[PDB]
């Protein structure tokens, strides 16, 4: 591994298991060699260069007196070393040396030697003097990259939790997670990997090809094999197994991906995992760019982001916002709801734009379209904040969302407050969809408004508590919320504990009935059987559910016409058509 001939259009150096060359040659693609290993890792354009494989690996500069010679591995010819006295190209940022050698287009990327020793710079970029003859600047990366990663050790110590935080570069899935799993298998650990969504879990399987990875489905309450494998499952799958199985594996290493997920199941999962760590029975790793103890809406990125603040349409527009459609790249747009999404998406197609819409229940079947199809826009709810990757150049983020809130004033009900501003963490994740890939145009994060920090009225913290104290363990131990997220609720521990058949109904209401946690709890803690659906009709006048401006009526399981009017009103069962369709299927006694 010394030097090569990029095909010739350019030349590279093969040091450090990384490949050093320039952006203007071969753009930003792959070089085909045996056993592969070729893909963009870092790029710069002021200093024309695309070091890939690793960050960088070229040390020392040429000073100001040392003579520097250039290799001449040119197309059709042999390598011809040529000694020169380096000149000086004075710029605004600083004067860098510039050698004057006569070479033909295609030899760009040849190494220059530090008088005696290794490479001191990269030849193949300069300007022509109309009066003079030839010139090329001594362009060199300064300073170096990271370059690669190796795993720390108390990461695997029992009774230690490790929050591994960094921006959407960054390799937490493609290079870091497999490095951890591989090190885990060497130490023969019962390892659990948790993903937020099934599609993200799919991205882990491909990233973990060659490793004993077994994806675990929620249709199974537990699965044990004498063979030593690694369990891969969704956060919610982990929680439901904790609620439905006694045979709970005592994993000694648990790795949660996207540990910022505020879904009631994810929070509860963090609550349980944290507790197992306190028992000195497991090691935990929480991977997320925005841990609960952070509020930076504009985190770092591995490519320059143009943060633009301007007015953004909340609904259908007709004139004014020419910048939205005049943009000729791919755009990801975050909307607070599916209703808002449709209103936005419909106006976009009128302008002749290919639009794909995304939501929680349509994520698995629409997200693959964002890869196969050529598209102009992607309208999404806050679901894309968790591991959703796009090949876009711009994000339009109104920073608005819907927030489930449990109203205590009077009869308890769950409303979907909003559109209210998102959390500082959420804004960072929406932004982090871009600035991942080095492009000639820096990515644009177009946003509006400021994020709000306080989300202690969010129903999910209470819902996560309801899930937690219904998880039984080798006691006397009560599972509580994960440290930072503990102050989000004033609920006393164990106050949501149910017993036997009530606890059983509670789980089935969620799993078989597809009901929200709060709604499932109210019914189950009321003593109502699962198959009994009479509470769906014995509600107050104001608890009448509407569907496209008309009062919903349901044909019961016996063949009777009743108005959909639940005793407890959770706004999330009739928020969108797909949610309402499912709940009507439940109230009918069809599932």
């Amino acid at each position: 591994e010394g030097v090569y001939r990029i095909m010739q259009v350019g030349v590279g150096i093969h040091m450090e298991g990384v490949f050093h060359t320039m952006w203007h040659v071969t753009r930003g693609s792959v070089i085909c060699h045996e056993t592969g290993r070729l893909e963009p890792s870092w790029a710069d354009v002021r200093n024309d260069m695309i070091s890939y494989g690793g960050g960088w690996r070229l040390g020392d500069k040429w000073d100001k007196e040392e003579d520097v010679q250039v290799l001449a591995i040119e197309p059709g010819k042999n390598p011809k070393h040529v000694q020169t006295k380096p000149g000086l190209f004075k710029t605004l940022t600083g004067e860098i040396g510039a050698v004057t050698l006569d070479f033909k287009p295609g030899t760009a990327g040849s190494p220059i030697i530090n008088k005696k020793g290794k490479v001191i710079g990269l030849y193949g970029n300069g300007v022509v003097t109309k009066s003079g003859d030839y010139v090329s600047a001594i362009t060199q990366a300064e300073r170096i990259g990271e370059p690669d990663y190796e795993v720390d050790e108390d990461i695997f110590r029992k009774k230690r939790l490790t929050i591994m935080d960094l921006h959407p570069g960054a390799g937490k899935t493609k290079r870091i997670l497999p490095s951890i799993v591989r090190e885990a298998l060497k130490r023969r650990l019962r390892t659990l990997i948790l993903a937020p969504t099934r599609v993200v879990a799919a991205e882990m399987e491909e990233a973990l090809r060659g490793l004993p990875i077994r994806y675990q489905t929620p249709a199974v309450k537990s699965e044990h094999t004498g063979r030593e494998i690694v369990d891969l499952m969704c956060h919610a799958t982990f929680t439901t197994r904790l609620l439905s199985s006694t045979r709970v594996p005592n994993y000694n290493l648990i790795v949660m991906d996207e540990a910022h997920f505020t879904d009631p199941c994810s929070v509860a999962a963090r609550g349980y995992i944290s507790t197992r760590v306190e028992m000195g029975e497991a090691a935990a790793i929480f991977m997320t760019a925005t841990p609960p103890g952070s509020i930076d809406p504009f985190p770092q990125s591995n490519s320059p982001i143009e943060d633009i603040e301007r007015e953004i349409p909340e609904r259908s527009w007709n004139t004014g916002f020419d910048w939205i459609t005049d943009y000729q790249g791919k755009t990801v747009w975050f909307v607070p709801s599916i209703k808002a999404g449709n209103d936005i998406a419909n106006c976009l197609r009128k302008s002749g734009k290919k639009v794909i819409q995304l939501s929680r229940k349509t994520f698995d079947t629409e997200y693959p379209k964002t890869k196969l199809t050529d598209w102009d826009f992607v309208v999404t709810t806050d679901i894309s904040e968790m591991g959703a990757n796009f090949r876009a150049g711009r994000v339009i983020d109104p920073r608005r969302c819907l927030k489930p809130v449990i109203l205590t004033d009077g009869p308890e009900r769950v409303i979907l407050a909003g559109p209210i501003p998102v959390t500082p963490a959420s804004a960072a994740q929406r932004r982090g969809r871009i600035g991942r890939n080095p492009a000639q145009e820096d990515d644009q994060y177009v946003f509006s408004g400021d994020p709000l920090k306080n989300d202690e009225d969010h129903a999910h913290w209470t819902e996560a508590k309801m899930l937690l104290d219904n998880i039984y363990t080798p006691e006397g131990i009560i599972p509580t919320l994960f440290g930072p997220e503990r102050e989000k609720t004033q609920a006393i521990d164990g106050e949501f504990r149910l017993r036997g058949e009530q606890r059983k109904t509670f789980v089935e209401l969620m799993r078989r009935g597809d009901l929200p946690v709060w709604l499932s709890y109210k019914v189950a803690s009321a003593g109502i059987s699962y198959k009994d659906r009479e509470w769906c009709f014995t509600g107050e006048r104001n608890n009448q559910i509407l569907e496209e401006n008309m009062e919903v009526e349901i044909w019961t399981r016996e063949g009777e016409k009743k108005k959909l009017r639940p005793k407890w009103l959770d706004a999330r069962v009739y928020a969108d058509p797909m949610a309402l369709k499912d709940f009507k299927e439940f109230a009918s006694g069809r599932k």
């Binding site: 010394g2 000694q83 004075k90 940022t93």
Partner: peptide
């Protein structure tokens, strides 16, 4: 083709001071 200095290399090149206009998109100018 390794990082090996060659003493038998040819010596060339003038060394003038060059005021350069550098930019993002491309390389260098005047």
């Amino acid at each position: 083709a390794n990082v090996q200095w060659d003493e038998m290399a040819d010596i060339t090149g003038s060394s003038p001071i060059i005021e350069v206009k550098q930019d993002e998109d491309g390389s260098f100018s005047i």
